[PDB]
Amino acid sequence: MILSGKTISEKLTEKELEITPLTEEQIQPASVDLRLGPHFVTIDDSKEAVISFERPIRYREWTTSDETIVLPPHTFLLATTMETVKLPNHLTAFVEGRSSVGRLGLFIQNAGWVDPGFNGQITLELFNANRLPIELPIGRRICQLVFAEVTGEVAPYQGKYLFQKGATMSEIYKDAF
Amino acid sequence: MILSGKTISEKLTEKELEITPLTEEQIQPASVDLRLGPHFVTIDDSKEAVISFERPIRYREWTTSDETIVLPPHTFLLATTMETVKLPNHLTAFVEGRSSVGRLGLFIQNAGWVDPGFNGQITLELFNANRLPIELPIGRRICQLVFAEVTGEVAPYQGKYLFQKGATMSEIYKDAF
Amino acid sequence: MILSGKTISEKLTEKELEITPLTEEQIQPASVDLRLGPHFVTIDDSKEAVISFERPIRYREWTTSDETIVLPPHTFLLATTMETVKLPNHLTAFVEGRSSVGRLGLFIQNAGWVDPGFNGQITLELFNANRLPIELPIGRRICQLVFAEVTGEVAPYQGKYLFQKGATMSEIYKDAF
Numbered sequence: 001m002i003l004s005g006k007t008i009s010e011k012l013t014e015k016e017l018e019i020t021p022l023t024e025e026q027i028q029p030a031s032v033d034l035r036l037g038p039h040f041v042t043i044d045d046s047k048e049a050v051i052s053f054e055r056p057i058r059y060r061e062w063t064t065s066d067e068t069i070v071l072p073p074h075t076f077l078l079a080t081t082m083e084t085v086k087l088p089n090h091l092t093a094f095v096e097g098r099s100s101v102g103r104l105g106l107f108i109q110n111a112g113w114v115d116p117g118f119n120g121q122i123t124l125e126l127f128n129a130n131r132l133p134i135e136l137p138i139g140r141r142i143c144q145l146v147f148a149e150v151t152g153e154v155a156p157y158q159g160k161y162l163f164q165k166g167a168t169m170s171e172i173y174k175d176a177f
Numbered sequence: 178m179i180l181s182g183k184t185i186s187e188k189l190t191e192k193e194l195e196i197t198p199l200t201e202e203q204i205q206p207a208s209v210d211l212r213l214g215p216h217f218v219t220i221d222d223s224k225e226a227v228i229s230f231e232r233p234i235r236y237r238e239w240t241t242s243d244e245t246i247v248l249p250p251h252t253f254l255l256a257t258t259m260e261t262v263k264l265p266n267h268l269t270a271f272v273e274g275r276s277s278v279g280r281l282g283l284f285i286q287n288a289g290w291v292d293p294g295f296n297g298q299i300t301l302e303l304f305n306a307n308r309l310p311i312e313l314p315i316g317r318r319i320c321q322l323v324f325a326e327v328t329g330e331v332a333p334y335q336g337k338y339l340f341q342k343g344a345t346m347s348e349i350y351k352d353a354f
Numbered sequence: 355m356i357l358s359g360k361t362i363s364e365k366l367t368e369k370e371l372e373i374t375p376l377t378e379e380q381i382q383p384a385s386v387d388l389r390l391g392p393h394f395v396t397i398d399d400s401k402e403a404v405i406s407f408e409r410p411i412r413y414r415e416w417t418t419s420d421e422t423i424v425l426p427p428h429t430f431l432l433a434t435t436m437e438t439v440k441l442p443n444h445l446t447a448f449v450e451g452r453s454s455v456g457r458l459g460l461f462i463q464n465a466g467w468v469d470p471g472f473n474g475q476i477t478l479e480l481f482n483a484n485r486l487p488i489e490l491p492i493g494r495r496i497c498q499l500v501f502a503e504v505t506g507e508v509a510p511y512q513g514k515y516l517f518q519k520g521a522t523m524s525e526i527y528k529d530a531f
């Protein structure tokens with residue numbers, strides 16, 4: 001079943017689930033809002049002519065001290081949540097944008113289910129689908145997690161992104177198969 | 178998790194859930210198709226240079242009497258469902274495009290879970306990802322809802338978009354934090 | 355509930371669910387990775403001026419023998435999984451991109467729930483959101499399925515895309531009502 005916000009609170013309190021740092025008002029009817037962090041990554045368009053899955057891609061990364069960041073029209077940017085999340089083996093969580101955000105043409109393209117056992121901040125794929133730039137304010141609620149129960153024995157997440165911090169560039173080129 | 182189409186039909190007939198107006202053939206194996214309404218909103222590019230999360234953004238809104246609307250290439254547009262949806266406290270619903278629509282490069286970017294207790298029409302985020310314009314026919318099935326049960330005590334949706342009608346502009350600037 | 359990877363394995367071995375061809379390492383904590391096939395479809399820009407929901411749209415389709423394909427910047431392309439999937443009536447599956455892929459600006463826009471009873475390859479909606487072209491390697495893991503149980507009686511999928519093979523163009527023009 002999808003977990004109610006209240007159930008999410010209970011599980012946090014009992015440490016079945018960790019989401020930190022967190023304010024109680026981030027808890028929603030059946031989701032929890034997460035916030036935009038100060039750290040960003042973009043593909044280095046001056047150095048790379050083509051994007052590849054078979055080798056590392058050069059990129060620029062930075063932490064801003066400003067209150068906002070600008071995302072220009074039709075531009076893609078990697079960001080991160082302030083929150084570090086730790087899921088036990090029997091939960092998964094669907095990351096999605098907040099409706100208020102998507103309605104301004106900011107698409108959280110990374111929308112998907114977090115592997116049970118995942119431990120880290122959440123890397124976000126931001127796309128400005130408008131013809132105008134968007135000013136993103138750091139620390140504002142940008143996306144949310146919807147939790148669901150997993151049935152059966154679980155082999156927990158042991159992949160590339162365990163313990164990730166910051167907007168974390170793809171490591172697709174490490175695929176063993 | 179997920180309610181079968183038949184279960185959705187039952188819950189509708191017993192008024193546990195409301196979706197209206199509705200034809201029986203909108204009911205699918207484990208989803209229900211919703212239709213594109215005549216009402217649209219776009220950002221007022223003659224008055225705004227930059228999109229902000231901290232104040233209202235001016236916009237143009239209109240209802241068309243034409244059978245179709247044209248969405249030009251690489252353009253983003255807010256739309257709405259014809260259907261008004263009312264969810265009880267123990268159900269949530271995932272909005273997503275229909276595969277037939279996404280395959281023509283029309284992306285329903287607003288894909289996500291509706292808060293338990295939500296009551297209103299659904300605002301859609303349309304993006305034409307082609308280099309050609311798309312003719313969207315009004316009243317055609319454009320997206321669908323996938324229903325899931327919620328476990329635990331629920332504080333129902335009391336947010337910005339309760340009772341929304343029409344394509345409804347973002348009210349992100351009303352965030353308390 | 356969402357099925358664990360182990361549960362997915364069991365159901366495969368007992369033929370409750372079919373996904374073929376498949377390597378055991380495609381199985382993940384609570385999902386299964388699928389691979390990019392060699393077959394592609396693009397809208398025929400030399401023959402169509404406008405995209406329509408009301409008639410067939412001309413397109414070019416091809417199978418590549420090359421190891422990679424190039425998707426130019428801000429371009430949308432239809433692709434397919436290598437895997438054929440057959441779902442019984444009591445399961446549904448959420449298709450989504452792999453985080454490693456989305457982080458390079460390749461969006462799997464078709465993200466959504468597969469109808470119970472669906473039988474076919476999965477057609478993917480690829481969008482390159484970067485300013486650089488992307489080289490997609492054929493046969494690499496590109497997306498994944500997250501399985502969920504369906505509660506209640508099910509009328510199985512009897513729609514347009516039963517038995518689909520290859521990147522399969524939209525048949526939206528076949529809608530009744």
Ligand SMILES: Cc1cn([C@H]2C[C@H](O)[C@@H](COP(=O)(O)OP(=O)(O)OP(=O)(O)O)O2)c(=O)[nH]c1=O
Nearest residue numbers: 095110112114115118122123159160452453454
């Ligand atoms: C959905 C999502 C996942 N993730 C994290 C949580 C997941 O457990 C983790 C892996 O997602 P996957 O989709 O499994 O990514 P992957 O297959 O490319 O990585 P691996 O080969 O290691 O499996 O990525 C984000 O950082 N942001 C997101 O938006």
Ligand SMILES: Cc1cn([C@H]2C[C@H](O)[C@@H](COP(=O)(O)OP(=O)(O)OP(=O)(O)O)O2)c(=O)[nH]c1=O
Nearest residue numbers: 275276277449464466469472476477513514515
């Ligand atoms: C989500 C997804 C579905 N599909 C397939 C599996 C689904 O059972 C099938 C239908 O999804 P739908 O979203 O129902 O598409 P539709 O309503 O446009 O088509 P129909 O009228 O036939 O119902 O499409 C893909 O090929 N790729 C995908 O990414």
Ligand SMILES: Cc1cn([C@H]2C[C@H](O)[C@@H](COP(=O)(O)OP(=O)(O)OP(=O)(O)O)O2)c(=O)[nH]c1=O
Nearest residue numbers: 098099100272287289291292295299300336337
């Ligand atoms: C997913 C979705 C939700 N909605 C509506 C129904 C949801 O219950 C409602 C809220 O979505 P949320 O993501 O909670 O919106 P928000 O957090 O930006 O707004 P609030 O601060 O009020 O929570 O928006 C749409 O109009 N279209 C959609 O595609």
Ligand SMILES: [Mg+2]
Nearest residue numbers: 028098099336
């Ligand atoms: Mg909200």
Ligand SMILES: [Mg+2]
Nearest residue numbers: 205275276513
């Ligand atoms: Mg359908």
Ligand SMILES: [Mg+2]
Nearest residue numbers: 159382452453
């Ligand atoms: Mg993975």
